[PDB]
Amino acid sequence: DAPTVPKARSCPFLPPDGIADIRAAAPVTRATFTSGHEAWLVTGYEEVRALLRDSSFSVQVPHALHTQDGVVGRGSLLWQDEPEHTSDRKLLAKEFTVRRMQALRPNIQRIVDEHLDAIEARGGPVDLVKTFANAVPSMVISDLFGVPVERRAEFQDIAEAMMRVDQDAAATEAAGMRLGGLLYQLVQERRANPGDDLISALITTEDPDGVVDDMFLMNAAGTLLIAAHDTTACMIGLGTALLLDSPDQLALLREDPSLVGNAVEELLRYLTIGQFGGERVATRDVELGGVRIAKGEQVVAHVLAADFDPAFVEEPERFDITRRPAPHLAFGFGAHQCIGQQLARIELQIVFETLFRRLPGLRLAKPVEELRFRHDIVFYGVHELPVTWH
Ligand code: HEM
């Protein structure tokens, strides 16, 4: 009967003032979480950072936005006990490199431009979620996986159905089984004709050792696609809405287009999508913030609270794209820190730069209070985002 976690905010566009008092008084405390179980709630920036850094806490339940009901071992990272996590991550990171992510900029520009061509070809108003936020990220992954333009239609549909919710338990599993089939065939085809893509590169990676089999490759491909899709789509949808509901910051961006990178980092901090780190368990006794956490006890990082700690940034409640980017914890920290963060940053940069440039006078087609948020314990995004432009 530890107290329930205080609600941080009623809307992602507001400061999370509801968690401030706990963070200030007790940055490591006991709370009861939505499942009805108690765990250590960690909200201070310093302590969340120290928790994520410490391999004494192993992940039991991954970050909520990186998993689907829903899907489908070695190569998945998310659902991986140690020491396989470490070695499988090292294998994947050998080919899914920051270099490979940077190398996708022209692909990302192309994809973003293609989606905006379709949008302005039709006008006006459009739902930015269906036409853009949900569509772009899976097509970037399609390119990462070497999917021919053919070929994209099928990939988009299957990935889309995977995100769909609401779909019933069955419908949900059937979507997962179709994705599984697609990915299995994809792996066979890349074996049959290798290319310059990530899957081809893994098939051919240094593997002493022999862990990279078809199962490993399906697990990695599924994980990256699923992890990249709802996270990035949420950032695009909520980030666009937050900018549109912040005419002060939008004006600063329009006055100084070089702020796009700063704006992406501030949106990441401000929204801290998913709110919590994956639930961890102590594999040994550990002292965190002066508090003894016993082996076997659960620990939940309140990353949103950490990203609003006044010890971390000044006047944290302010949404201010002029800030020099600070090391927020929206991509985590330590061993499980987000492996796709450079890709996410690159995609959001191209997305926001192109959107606001190509659709001058972009604005909400309906007041903000009419937006409908996907919320299930935490916010997953907006259902639709009706927009117009000049
Ligand atoms: C778009 C915004 C994204 C955000 C805000 C985000 C956030 C995070 C966070 C906070 C973690 C750490 C979870 C924890 O320590 O409990 C994480 C891990 C992870 N992320 Fe992301 N992510 C994003 C995009 C992506 C993308 C694009 C990919 C893949 C291309 C991805 C793949 C992963 C994977 C596989 C992990 C687990 C890494 C491991 O367990 O070693 N994420 N992400």
TrEMBL record:
Residues where heme b 2 binds: H85, R89, G278, R280, H336, C338
PROSITE patterns with a match to the protein in the record: CYTOCHROME_P450 (PS00086)
Residue sites binding heme b 1 per the record: H66, R89, G278, R280, H336, C338
CDD domains: CYP105-like
InterPro entries: Cyt_P450, Cyt_P450_B, Cyt_P450_CS, Cyt_P450_sf
Pfam family, one: p450
GO MF annotation: an example: monooxygenase activity
Record carries keyword Oxidoreductase: yes
Alphabetized UniProt keyword annotations: Heme, Iron, Metal-binding, Monooxygenase, Oxidoreductase
Domain of life: Bacteria
Keyword Hydrolase: no
Family: Belongs to the cytochrome P450 family.
Name of the protein: Cytochrome P450
Species of provenance: Streptomyces avermitilis
